[PDB]
Design a binder for this molecule. Structure first.
Ligand SMILES: Nc1ncnc2c1ncn2[C@@H]1O[C@H](CSCC[C@H](N)C(=O)O)[C@@H](O)[C@H]1O
Ligand SMILES: Nc1ncnc2c1ncn2[C@@H]1O[C@H](CSCC[C@H](N)C(=O)O)[C@@H](O)[C@H]1O
Lengths: 183, 277, 277, 186
């Protein structure tokens, strides 16, 4: 658990958004600033050929974000590929142990992972997910960000049979105590 | 300061080829933690090594704290199942996705940046594999594999990819004085080898006949025997004479095992880092 | 005055227990003619003795001229099939009538009057037998049998009748320093014996469970293993690791075999009549 | 094989007849006489407890005869028991190798032995049998060292029919070449 930083020492956050982009979506909370085209968000999709030196040259970073594709888009890649590549690039992006500083990660899932995929993700990310609903859409979130109701699983199960950054931005709130608040 | 016995974490240990190679090289083994599911393989390892192997069952039930307390580890070896790398599910579905687990646990066993203690690791897979899967494996392991065929030290074809940081993995493979190089050297008495080398032996019984039966006995064609396969792969005779296993079960175990001389070639440089006898 | 290697005719040789006993005693074997029809047993003998056993086939195809040419014989041993000695066909129908063949060939191998050269013979059968059949066997062999149970030297009950003129067939049976007398001495690592002795082991698999399974491994019940039966019967381990045989075939071969220590007890006096190493 | 003996040196034959008796049957050819206390013929049916010293105490023999029971007789003993016991007592009755004297044996079968029994008998007696038939129907098989055309289907169907006694008539003429070796009573 990290200590909170005084407001005058807070800095412009640097974020690594894998797969899904939240650029303007994250500006909507004040973490990025409009005008800086050489901004503080790096976005990549085809991470198959990205080496650790690639991530190190794009860094440093303070947040690493990964997301599954939206539910309904027939995936060209298997659902677990996103989780595994997120884990790889996250370990590439973690700070060295001899320089501890605030560092956060988040992987969100749009109900594309099944039970075994959920278990693999919970094993690699070392925590059980947290579900966020909508009264209908929902997401799962693994993150080391300290989050602030009650839904059963069959609702999600039957909702998936039928055929979303609104539920994600609320998780980014407790990060304000660590970085600048633009706008 | 002083050489200490090697501590090994073996994932998908099989019939404990790693422990056998380390013991045959004269290296003192202080701890050998093996993750393995097949009860016949665990029985083989337990009986042949008299309980020196700490079995921990499924690899996916190994926790970060498990790696912390079972450790520290000097060597981390792994051999993922290759039945998914025609109904193949690739690297990401089926049992190919087990590879990442290895990767996972490997990063759990690595020493920190400040720790400069010796730490070696190795991962084996089959050459017959999607080039994209080989690409992703090289990505996750941050290195490229060596390709070693057992035919240079054994009497069979077995080309496998080996990733790792062992010393001299790319050095040339030369045969030893005791390497039974031809099929005739591996056969029991009164049996004649039709060929000098045999094709790649998998788990199925359709990889023995070359499909012409490899052996002639009393003028009649015949398949290979359990002890003959054991000699082919470099294991001691009767290494799989465990648990009332017939020819089929022992062939299943040996067809996915490692070639003992290949693993000996790879592990030989380790004698200059750990206590020997 | 100086002895020569022994020449043996073994009828119903099985897995060549007689040759193994004679070799373990240090007696030089000049010739060993074995009559046997089971291909698995012939394979076991051939591989384990490297072709030193001249195998003939069915005992009923051995002619008087065959006994003259292959001879002369110093030892004539025999072990008739005991599956007919509920649908039992007795001594005169089925396979029991093979006994007389032994008798027949025995009188072909006997030296003539005045030929006072040493000549020994032995015939084994099971105690479970109609007393009329035992009477007729004693009639045809012109002597009475000594009953020996393998439990005094091995970890199993095996009471058998032995006819013959071997020296000291009635002397008391004493165990040796190396005789594994209890089941625990015959088990593999990480396996516990429920009992100290096991009931009579036949070819069928219902004679292992005592029907309580004899072994406990990892807290679970388990039957005996091939190497365990081999130790129980006194054979060297992996003696029947031949011809891709599973637990069933090897158990079938060992369940009708001889108890090695019993045959050693019976054959030990032969060291004073023939050449030794 | 023996040499024929001059007629003045021929002796009263001594025979061992097992199972089936030929005493009164063999007197008809002159080998025995009515006025004899030992009778020269030793007959015994139950040979299960016969030891070698028993046969030796029964005086030397020159002929050993054994026969299977008649065909129309339900066998209480297995058919091969007679063959094996005949072989045993014959080996008991053979003269020692240091005394080569004339000695003959004969085993006859009333079609009670099947094919495997026939092969066993031919293996133990070291010769193939000879079949003697009866025209207007019976038959016998003979193994013997005495220097004395019908297909097998005839005997097969005959044996299957003849179930529902012992023909010495067919065996009698086999004893003829033994006349050149022993006395011929009037
Ligand atoms: N989920 C899992 N956890 C642990 N072991 C597993 C596993 N899935 C398969 N295995 C084991 O991994 C083995 C791979 S075959 C390779 C065996 C070993 N490399 C040798 O040389 O002998 C198989 O025998 C199988 O029993
Ligand atoms: N007709 C026959 N001719 C030769 N061998 C025969 C036979 N019938 C059976 N046998 C063999 O005789 C064996 C008897 S079991 C006894 C085997 C031997 N005494 C031992 O101790 O190992 C059987 O294995 C069977 O294969």
């Amino acid at each position: 658990m990290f200590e909170t930083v005084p407001v005058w020492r807070r800095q412009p956050v640097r974020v690594l958004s894998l797969f899904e982009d939240i650029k303007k979506e994250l500006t909507s909370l004040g973490f990025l600033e409009s005008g800086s085209d050489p901004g503080q968000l790096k976005h990549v999709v085809d991470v198959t050929d990205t080496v650790r030196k690639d991530v190190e040259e794009w860094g440093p970073f303070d947040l690493v974000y990964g997301a599954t594709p939206p539910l309904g888009h027939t995936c060209d890649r298997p659902p677990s590929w996103y989780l595994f590549q997120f884990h790889r690039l996250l370990q590439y992006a973690r700070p060295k142990p001899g320089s501890p500083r605030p560092f956060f990660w988040m992987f969100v899932d749009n109900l594309v992972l099944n039970k075994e995929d959920l278990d693999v993700a919970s094993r690699f990310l070392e925590m059980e997910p947290v579900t966020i609903p909508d009264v209908q859409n929902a997401v799962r979130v693994w993150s080391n960000i300290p989050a602030i109701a009650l839904v059963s699983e069959e609702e999600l199960s039957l909702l998936a049979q039928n055929k979303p950054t609104k539920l994600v931005k609320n998780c980014f709130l407790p990060l304000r105590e660590y970085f600048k608040y633009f706008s | 300061m002083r050489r200490r016995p090697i501590r090994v974490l073996s994932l998908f240990d099989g019939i404990a080829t790693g422990y056998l190679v380390l013991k045959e090289l004269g290296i003192k083994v202080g701890k050998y933690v093996a993750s393995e599911v097949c009860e016949e393989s665990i029985a083989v390892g337990t009986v042949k090594h008299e309980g020196n192997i700490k079995y921990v069952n499924d690899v996916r039930n190994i926790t970060k704290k498990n790696i912390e307390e079972w450790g520290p580890f000097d060597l981390v070896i792994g051999g993922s199942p290759c039945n998914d790398l025609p109904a193949r599910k690739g690297l990401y579905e089926g049992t190919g996705r087990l590879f990442f687990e290895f990767y996972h646990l490997l990063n759990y066993s690595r020493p920190k940046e400040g720790d400069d203690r010796p730490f070696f690791w190795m991962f084996e897979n089959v050459v017959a594999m999607k080039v994209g899967d080989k690409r992703d494996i090289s990505r996750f392991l941050e290195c490229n594999p060596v390709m070693i065929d057992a035919i240079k030290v054994s009497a069979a074809h077995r080309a496998r990819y080996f990733w790792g940081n062992l010393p001299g993995m790319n050095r040339p493979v030369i045969a030893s004085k005791n390497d039974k190089l031809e099929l005739q050297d591996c056969l029991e008495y009164n049996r004649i080898a039709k060929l000098k080398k045999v094709q790649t032996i998998t788990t199925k019984s359709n990889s023995i006949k070359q499909q012409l039966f490899p052996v002639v006995m009393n003028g009649k064609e015949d398949v290979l025997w359990c002890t003959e396969l054991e000699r082919i792969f470099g294991f001691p005779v009767h290494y799989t004479d465990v648990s009332n296993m017939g020819g089929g079960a022992r062939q299943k175990l040996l067809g996915r095992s490692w070639s003992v001389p290949v693993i000996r070639h790879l592990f030989a440089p380790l004698k200059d880092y750990f206590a020997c006898e």
